Design a protein around this nucleic acid. Structure first.
Ligand SMILES: [Mg+2]
Ligand SMILES: [Mg+2]
Ligand SMILES: [Mg+2]
Ligand SMILES: [Mg+2]
Ligand SMILES: [Mg+2]
Ligand SMILES: [Mg+2]
Ligand SMILES: [Mg+2]
Ligand SMILES: [Mg+2]
Ligand SMILES: [Mg+2]
Ligand SMILES: [Mg+2]
Ligand SMILES: [Mg+2]
Ligand SMILES: [Mg+2]
Ligand SMILES: [Mg+2]
Ligand SMILES: [Mg+2]
Ligand SMILES: [Mg+2]
Ligand SMILES: [Mg+2]
Ligand SMILES: [Mg+2]
Ligand SMILES: [Mg+2]
Ligand SMILES: [Mg+2]
Ligand SMILES: [Mg+2]
Ligand SMILES: [Mg+2]
Ligand SMILES: [Mg+2]
Ligand SMILES: [Mg+2]
Ligand SMILES: [Mg+2]
Ligand SMILES: [Mg+2]
Ligand SMILES: [Mg+2]
Ligand SMILES: [Mg+2]
Ligand SMILES: [Mg+2]
Ligand SMILES: [Mg+2]
Ligand SMILES: [Mg+2]
Ligand SMILES: [Mg+2]
Ligand SMILES: [Mg+2]
Ligand SMILES: [Mg+2]
Ligand SMILES: [Mg+2]
Ligand SMILES: [Mg+2]
Ligand SMILES: [Mg+2]
Ligand SMILES: [Mg+2]
Ligand SMILES: [Mg+2]
Ligand SMILES: [Mg+2]
Ligand SMILES: [Mg+2]
Ligand SMILES: [Mg+2]
Ligand SMILES: [Mg+2]
Ligand SMILES: [Mg+2]
Ligand SMILES: [Mg+2]
Ligand SMILES: [Mg+2]
Ligand SMILES: [Mg+2]
Ligand SMILES: [Mg+2]
Ligand SMILES: [Mg+2]
Ligand SMILES: [Mg+2]
Ligand SMILES: [Mg+2]
Ligand SMILES: [Mg+2]
Ligand SMILES: [Mg+2]
Ligand SMILES: [Mg+2]
Ligand SMILES: [Mg+2]
Ligand SMILES: [Mg+2]
Ligand SMILES: [Mg+2]
Ligand SMILES: [Mg+2]
Ligand SMILES: [Mg+2]
Ligand SMILES: [Mg+2]
Ligand SMILES: [Mg+2]
Ligand SMILES: [Mg+2]
Ligand SMILES: [Mg+2]
Ligand SMILES: [Mg+2]
Ligand SMILES: [Mg+2]
Ligand SMILES: [Mg+2]
Ligand SMILES: [Mg+2]
Ligand SMILES: [Mg+2]
Ligand SMILES: [Mg+2]
Ligand SMILES: [Mg+2]
Ligand SMILES: [Mg+2]
Ligand SMILES: [Mg+2]
Ligand SMILES: [Mg+2]
Ligand SMILES: [Mg+2]
Ligand SMILES: [Mg+2]
Ligand SMILES: [Mg+2]
Ligand SMILES: [Mg+2]
Ligand SMILES: [Mg+2]
Ligand SMILES: [Mg+2]
Ligand SMILES: [Mg+2]
Ligand SMILES: [Mg+2]
Ligand SMILES: [Mg+2]
Ligand SMILES: [Mg+2]
Ligand SMILES: [Mg+2]
Ligand SMILES: [Mg+2]
Ligand SMILES: [Mg+2]
Ligand SMILES: [Mg+2]
Ligand SMILES: [Mg+2]
Ligand SMILES: [Mg+2]
Ligand SMILES: [Mg+2]
Ligand SMILES: [Mg+2]
Ligand SMILES: [Mg+2]
Ligand SMILES: [Mg+2]
Ligand SMILES: [Mg+2]
Ligand SMILES: [Mg+2]
Ligand SMILES: [Mg+2]
Ligand SMILES: [Mg+2]
Ligand SMILES: [Mg+2]
Ligand SMILES: [Mg+2]
Ligand SMILES: [Mg+2]
Ligand SMILES: [Mg+2]
Ligand SMILES: [Mg+2]
Ligand SMILES: [Mg+2]
Ligand SMILES: [Mg+2]
Ligand SMILES: [Mg+2]
Ligand SMILES: [Mg+2]
Ligand SMILES: [Mg+2]
Ligand SMILES: [Mg+2]
Ligand SMILES: [Mg+2]
Ligand SMILES: [Mg+2]
Ligand SMILES: [Mg+2]
Ligand SMILES: [Mg+2]
Ligand SMILES: [Mg+2]
Ligand SMILES: [Mg+2]
Ligand SMILES: [Mg+2]
Ligand SMILES: [Mg+2]
Ligand SMILES: [Mg+2]
Ligand SMILES: [Mg+2]
Ligand SMILES: [Mg+2]
Ligand SMILES: [Mg+2]
Ligand SMILES: [Mg+2]
Ligand SMILES: [Mg+2]
Ligand SMILES: [Mg+2]
Ligand SMILES: [Mg+2]
Ligand SMILES: [Mg+2]
Ligand SMILES: [Mg+2]
Ligand SMILES: [Zn+2]
Ligand SMILES: [Zn+2]
Lengths: 110, 181, 69, 141, 77, 53
RNA sequence: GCGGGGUGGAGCAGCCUGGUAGCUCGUCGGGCUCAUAACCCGAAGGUCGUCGGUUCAAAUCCGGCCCCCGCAACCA
RNA sequence: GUUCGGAUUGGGGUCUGCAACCCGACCCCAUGAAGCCGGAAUCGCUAGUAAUCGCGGAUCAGCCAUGCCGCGGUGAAUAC
RNA sequence: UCCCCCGUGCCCAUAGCGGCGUGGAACCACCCGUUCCCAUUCCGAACACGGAAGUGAAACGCGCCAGCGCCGAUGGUACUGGGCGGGCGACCGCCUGGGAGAGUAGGUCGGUGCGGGGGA
RNA sequence: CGCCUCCUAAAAGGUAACGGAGGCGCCCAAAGGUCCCCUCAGGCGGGACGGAAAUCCGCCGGAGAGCGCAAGGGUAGAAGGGGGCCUGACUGCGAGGCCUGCAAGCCGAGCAGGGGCGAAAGCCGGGCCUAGUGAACCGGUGGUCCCGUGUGGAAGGGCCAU
RNA sequence: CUGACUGGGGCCUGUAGAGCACUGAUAGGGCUAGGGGGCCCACCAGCCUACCAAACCCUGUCAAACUCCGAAGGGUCCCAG
């Protein structure tokens, strides 16, 4: 018996894989926000970034934009440029939208 | 947020006495109110005068909250019902507006009721929830004899966080519900 | 909440005919009621209004013991 | 007599009668049984004849178990017509019975009472039969 | 005597068109089906009538992923 | 296609040529169809209008 | 074998085009008459041959079985 | 459908009578029905009459009398 | 390289239902608010934001139990590719190679990849 | 008597009979594109008028509902339900294949023009799918400005569309 | 040298057989709505049922247009004779 959270999750994630891109999946908890870029062909994570690993400050929204500029920064160093955004169960808005835009300024392509 | 009598009374008198009688080991284990849903299964407005802004204007005054429509799930011959036809109203009260409504309900409404002999003890869910009916919306204070065209009562559903009828019964009586038997 | 669809809530003065006044909130600042929780027959313990009847019938006739034995 | 009260389809292809029974091959209810030695379509008319015969021996007493049921519809073209113009009409119902099935079992009766009704029953059938009583082998299935 | 029956439809010649380990070109049809008996996997398109066909030159592979259904893939050569 | 479900054409409202043909239910949709479609003549999109077939 | 049919008690509508059962007589209660008829005033009664299905809903559309009318059954 | 109308019933009392269950009248509290002027049809009355109003008497313990036999008050329309 | 938790996959119920027990430092959750972004055919329930007083009550994670569900041999049989017999038939046998399903024994209250966070 | 579904059909495809059963000769301006959100039938309990069945609350319920219409296949990790903006129910093409005697029928990635939705990855050349159909001849209609019987026009034809 | 046939290997399938989980059928038993029947009532509930009988459970079975299962075979592609 699935839940709206679970179904919505598959619902967007399934459409992302099919386009074959590297996925910039984003996790957003009550305090923190994590993001890892995954190659689903190997079941393997290639680069990560999280607020909790960066020990970042207060405002969740700016925190997101900063973990975003971070993820890109480590990313372009591995040649990763093209990638696709996994908004998971999270509406593209607020904290998640902010991380996305951070990744963009960083130069990651999407 | 709002300080109101029943909301206050819940934490102050209802909460402790409940912890007494059933001895919970966690604050969240103890019975709470989640929501009171009000309903008007109406359907007298199926065809006829499907203008029921008069009752949506009514329910909006009673609860300080705009009701939503309910529409037919399936068409019915014997009821003369097209699928999707507008046949009722439903407003869901949570938090402050929930208390304020129950507050006026317990202190005013049930008293004004024709030959009131106490709420039905047996209208208990089995899973600790409670439902009751009203024959008239005049039963409330905010609806004068003047502003009404016709008698229209309602369904009232109150959801608890309880698991049994017994904790539910206590939570509600402790709040101020008058039961006959 | 949404704006422009919602009646506005204000501190309200419900008055009863016993002279109970209730401090609450409502869409109307002042209301009078005919009856309340503070005075109702079923409500006030067991104030059995007009009839503390005990029936009285049917043993109760007793008019009288004057029929003979 | 026996016949399905309703069915998804009116007419059924004829099929085959190869092999021993798929099941129904062990005593299950009564004390004694009548088992089919060779394959056949046993008609309702025979099952009822066989049944009635058995109750007719017992008079008052016993219990009769019918383990076969005529669910296969039997078709015949109307007399004197030529081939073609569709499938015949359903005229009766049959029980498809292979070698080794119990068709009838009896209970609550002396052994000679049972040997005899099962025998008399057996004459009413279009096949050879063997009478068997319940063994631990039956018990063990 | 007459029949109220008599009719049937043209057969549609459905089923798998290319089996596992067979080399296909981009465009080749792989499976013809009514509904998703098989699902498109890597390098496999699906047409408006459910027809699975190859998106790249390469080699067919099947995969039975339980409750996730059966999949057809093409592996680049 | 029927008596009520008619066939029709769409005329480019700018160059007046018919580039697309379709159908409608004239009871369900009594007004003339209006749609933007690529007109091959003007080489862009144009509001196209239902015209007699 | 092909076409048509079964609706208060009698005889016909309504079915095609699904929602709504109608007409004449008859029955019953009242009136005129000494009385009956006629005539006048009111009123009851069909759950539509069945069983199944389609539908939101079937007298109505579709299937099964039943009974009735008509026509056919030829070269042989 | 009312301060119209007063049936129906609930509750409580008075009286007559040996006795008011079936089955009396009357008084009081409450209940407050049908009925918005009557289908086909049909009755009475020609003047102090019809219509309307009250009073008495016979029978008779009481009374189901709104019946009957009388009595006065007011008092018409119309007959080509 | 080991333990716990947060992510995200793979295997596709040996992973599930139920029952009992356990975890809040950390992470996660509920939670505290509804100013702001955003939101309710009504409702800050959901989605969303700003938060960190409390609580592991719900959820989740981790263990335990075989009542249900799920998996399930060995053996034997049915059936059968090919090769031969028998019967008037319905049908029935032998040889060689293949071999179920049911049922029985029994197994199961998950295993594993990658990246993070913490601990030894 | 053509077309679709199931069985017969002997586990590839195909397969006959006056064998067994049913459907089609439509439909939808949204019942289409896309973005976002949502999850059913049914059972038990509870609720004014309220019923077996209207609408409301809770718990159980993997799909037994729904998907216009027959059946099968498919399907909630949506193809089902709601909303917003929209017209790709495109123009010019088409690598490569399914099927197949012919002629037909079908699926289709991708390049270009000019668009729609989306932050984007991307999707979109009607519809969950398989029926809803008719080759050519003759002619009608809109456009094109190709031929125009000595020449300029015209008549009439060709081409694209219907 | 690519052929019929043959060896190994992968993928495809829903028949034989079997099964009752779905669609239907189905004999007996248990349990049990609904009616019928017999007591008692019209004050509305009750009690008994060697009666007909839903849904559920058990035992036991049937099916071209049923399948939780499911062969031997068969089709196709690669390498080899
Ligand atoms: Mg892996
Ligand atoms: Mg209860
Ligand atoms: Mg009021
Ligand atoms: Mg509760
Ligand atoms: Mg045959
Ligand atoms: Mg025979
Ligand atoms: Mg036959
Ligand atoms: Mg005949
Ligand atoms: Mg024949
Ligand atoms: Mg025949
Ligand atoms: Mg026969
Ligand atoms: Mg047998
Ligand atoms: Mg014999
Ligand atoms: Mg067995
Ligand atoms: Mg005939
Ligand atoms: Mg015919
Ligand atoms: Mg046929
Ligand atoms: Mg054929
Ligand atoms: Mg064919
Ligand atoms: Mg076919
Ligand atoms: Mg296939
Ligand atoms: Mg497509
Ligand atoms: Mg499609
Ligand atoms: Mg493989
Ligand atoms: Mg692969
Ligand atoms: Mg008649
Ligand atoms: Mg007609
Ligand atoms: Mg009509
Ligand atoms: Mg009469
Ligand atoms: Mg007469
Ligand atoms: Mg229906
Ligand atoms: Mg009707
Ligand atoms: Mg019917
Ligand atoms: Mg019906
Ligand atoms: Mg009929
Ligand atoms: Mg004749
Ligand atoms: Mg009145
Ligand atoms: Mg009396
Ligand atoms: Mg009055
Ligand atoms: Mg009246
Ligand atoms: Mg008046
Ligand atoms: Mg008068
Ligand atoms: Mg008068
Ligand atoms: Mg007259
Ligand atoms: Mg005179
Ligand atoms: Mg006197
Ligand atoms: Mg007197
Ligand atoms: Mg009297
Ligand atoms: Mg008098
Ligand atoms: Mg995890
Ligand atoms: Mg894992
Ligand atoms: Mg568990
Ligand atoms: Mg604990
Ligand atoms: Mg736990
Ligand atoms: Mg904590
Ligand atoms: Mg702590
Ligand atoms: Mg706080
Ligand atoms: Mg605000
Ligand atoms: Mg602010
Ligand atoms: Mg909140
Ligand atoms: Mg817990
Ligand atoms: Mg969660
Ligand atoms: Mg164990
Ligand atoms: Mg298995
Ligand atoms: Mg097994
Ligand atoms: Mg074995
Ligand atoms: Mg052989
Ligand atoms: Mg053999
Ligand atoms: Mg062998
Ligand atoms: Mg062997
Ligand atoms: Mg097998
Ligand atoms: Mg086995
Ligand atoms: Mg387990
Ligand atoms: Mg790990
Ligand atoms: Mg680590
Ligand atoms: Mg045709
Ligand atoms: Mg076939
Ligand atoms: Mg086949
Ligand atoms: Mg085949
Ligand atoms: Mg082929
Ligand atoms: Mg036909
Ligand atoms: Mg829409
Ligand atoms: Mg659609
Ligand atoms: Mg839309
Ligand atoms: Mg429900
Ligand atoms: Mg209910
Ligand atoms: Mg009710
Ligand atoms: Mg209801
Ligand atoms: Mg379905
Ligand atoms: Mg726009
Ligand atoms: Mg080609
Ligand atoms: Mg061809
Ligand atoms: Mg075709
Ligand atoms: Mg574009
Ligand atoms: Mg844009
Ligand atoms: Mg394209
Ligand atoms: Mg559609
Ligand atoms: Mg279509
Ligand atoms: Mg076509
Ligand atoms: Mg010609
Ligand atoms: Mg010709
Ligand atoms: Mg022409
Ligand atoms: Mg020229
Ligand atoms: Mg010239
Ligand atoms: Mg000139
Ligand atoms: Mg010229
Ligand atoms: Mg000119
Ligand atoms: Mg021209
Ligand atoms: Mg010209
Ligand atoms: Mg053309
Ligand atoms: Mg060679
Ligand atoms: Mg070869
Ligand atoms: Mg070869
Ligand atoms: Mg070979
Ligand atoms: Mg078989
Ligand atoms: Mg079954
Ligand atoms: Mg079993
Ligand atoms: Mg068979
Ligand atoms: Mg079959
Ligand atoms: Mg079979
Ligand atoms: Mg094989
Ligand atoms: Mg074959
Ligand atoms: Mg082979
Ligand atoms: Mg092979
Ligand atoms: Mg070779
Ligand atoms: Zn008061
Ligand atoms: Zn144009």
């Amino acid at each position: 018996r699935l839940t709206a959270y679970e179904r919505r999750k598959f619902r967007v994630r399934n459409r992302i894989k099919r386009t074959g891109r590297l996925r910039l999946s984003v996790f957003r908890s009550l305090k923190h926000i994590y993001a890892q870029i995954i190659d689903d062909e190997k079941g393997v994570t290639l680069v990560s970034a999280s607020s909790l690993a960066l020990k970042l400050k207060g405002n969740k929204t700016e925190v997101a934009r900063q973990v975003g500029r971070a993820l890109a920064e480590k990313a372009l160093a591995l040649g990763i440029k093209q990638v696709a955004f996994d908004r998971g169960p999270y509406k593209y808005h607020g904290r998640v939208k902010a991380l996305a835009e951070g990744a963009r300024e960083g130069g990651l392509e999407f | 947020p709002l300080d109101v009598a029943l909301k206050r009374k819940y934490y102050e008198e209802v909460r402790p006495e409940l912890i007494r009688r059933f001895g919970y080991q966690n604050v969240w284990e103890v019975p709470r109110l989640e929501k009171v849903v009000i309903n008007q299964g109406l359907g007298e407005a199926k065809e006829d005068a499907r203008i029921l802004e008069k009752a949506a204007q009514e329910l909006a005054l009673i609860t300080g909250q705009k009701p939503a429509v309910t529409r037919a799930k399936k068409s019915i011959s014997n009821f003369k019902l097209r699928k999707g036809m507008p046949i009722g109203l439903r407003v869901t009260l949570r938090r402050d507006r929930m208390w304020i409504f129950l507050e006026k309900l317990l202190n005013v409404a049930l008293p004004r009721i024709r030959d009131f002999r106490g709420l039905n003890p047996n209208s208990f869910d089995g899973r600790g929830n409670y439902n009751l009916g009203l024959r008239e919306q005049l039963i409330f204070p905010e609806i004068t004899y003047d502003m009404v065209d016709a008698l229209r009562g309602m369904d009232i559903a109150v959801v608890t966080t309880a698991e049994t009828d017994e904790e539910a019964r206590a939570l509600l009586e402790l709040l101020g519900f008058p039961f006959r038997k | 909440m949404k704006e422009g669809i919602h009646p506005k809530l204000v501190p309200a003065r419900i008055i009863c005919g016993c002279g109970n006044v209730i401090e609450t909130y409502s869409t109307k600042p002042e209301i009078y009621v005919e009856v309340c929780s503070k005075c109702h027959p079923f409500y006030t313990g067991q104030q059995r209004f007009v009839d503390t009847e005990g029936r009285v019938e049917r043993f109760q006739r007793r008019y009288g013991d004057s029929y003979r034995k | 007599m026996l016949m399905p009260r309703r069915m998804k389809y009116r007419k059924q292809q004829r099929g085959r009668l190869k092999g021993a029974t798929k099941g129904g091959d062990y005593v299950a209810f009564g004390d004694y049984g009548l088992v089919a030695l060779e394959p056949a379509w046993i008609t309702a008319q025979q099952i009822e004849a066989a049944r009635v015969a058995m109750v007719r021996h017992f008079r008052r007493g016993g219990k009769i178990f019918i383990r076969i049921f005529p669910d296969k519809p039997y078709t015949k073209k109307p007399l004197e017509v030529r081939m073609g113009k569709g499938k015949g009409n359903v005229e009766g119902y049959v029980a498809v019975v292979k070698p080794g099935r119990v068709m009838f079992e009896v209970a609550g009766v002396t052994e000679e009472q049972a040997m005899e009704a099962l025998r008399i029953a057996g004459h009413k059938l279009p096949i050879k039969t063997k009478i068997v009583r319940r063994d631990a082998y039956d018990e063990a299935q | 005597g007459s029949t109220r029956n008599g009719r049937d439809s043209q057969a549609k010649r459905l089923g798998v068109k290319r089996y596992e380990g067979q080399v296909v070109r981009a465009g080749n049809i792989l499976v013809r089906q009514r509904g998703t008996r098989f699902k498109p996997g890597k390098n496999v398109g699906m047409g408006r009538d459910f027809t699975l066909f190859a998106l790249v030159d390469g080699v067919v592979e099947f995969q039975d992923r339980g409750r996730l259904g059966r999949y057809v893939h093409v592996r680049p050569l | 296609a029927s008596e009520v479900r008619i066939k029709l054409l769409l005329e480019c409202t700018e160059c007046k040529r018919r580039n697309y043909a379709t159908e409608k239910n004239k009871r369900n949709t009594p007004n003339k169809l209006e749609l933007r479609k690529y007109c091959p003549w003007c080489r862009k999109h144009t509001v196209h209008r239902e015209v007699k077939i």
